[PDB]
Design a protein around this ligand. Structure first.
Ligand code: NA
Length: 129
């Protein structure tokens, strides 16, 4: 599924991501924009042989099991394929653990480089929330 900006903002709120660990809904929408361009089916192979899955590009290296990431953990206790669902529950649940892991949203390198410090409220501007 390819979410609209306000559609994703609404689904993230419905799943309690808005101000989770102090990160406004705009931070999460901005992260999804640059990680997946709002596409729940986005997959990207890392040079290290791990894969990033879904709207928030959760990495098989630590967070999900894809069966082909040697030495890797599955700390969200889910198959990486479950992070490709049109329903974002699994991605939201796992992102809540990632953003609690101690470096906040710096875990998303696209967030650090393209959202951090920017006017992130622009991402939820005009959204009925
Ligand atoms: Na893994």
């Amino acid at each position: 599924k390819v979410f609209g900006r306000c559609e994703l903002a609404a689904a993230m709120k419905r799943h309690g991501l808005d101000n989770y660990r102090g990160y406004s809904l705009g931070n999460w929408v901005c992260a999804a924009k640059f990680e997946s361009n709002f596409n729940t089916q986005a997959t990207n192979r890392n040079t290290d042989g791990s894969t990033d899955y879904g709207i928030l590009q959760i990495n098989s290296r630590w967070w999900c099991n894809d069966g082909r990431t040697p030495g890797s953990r599955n700390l969200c206790n889910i198959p990486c394929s479950a992070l490709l669902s049109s329903d974002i529950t699994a991605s939201v649940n796992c992102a809540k653990k990632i953003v609690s892991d101690g470096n906040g949203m710096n875990a998303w390198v696209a967030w650090r480089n393209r959202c951090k410090g920017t006017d992130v409220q622009a991402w939820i501007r005009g959204c009925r929330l």
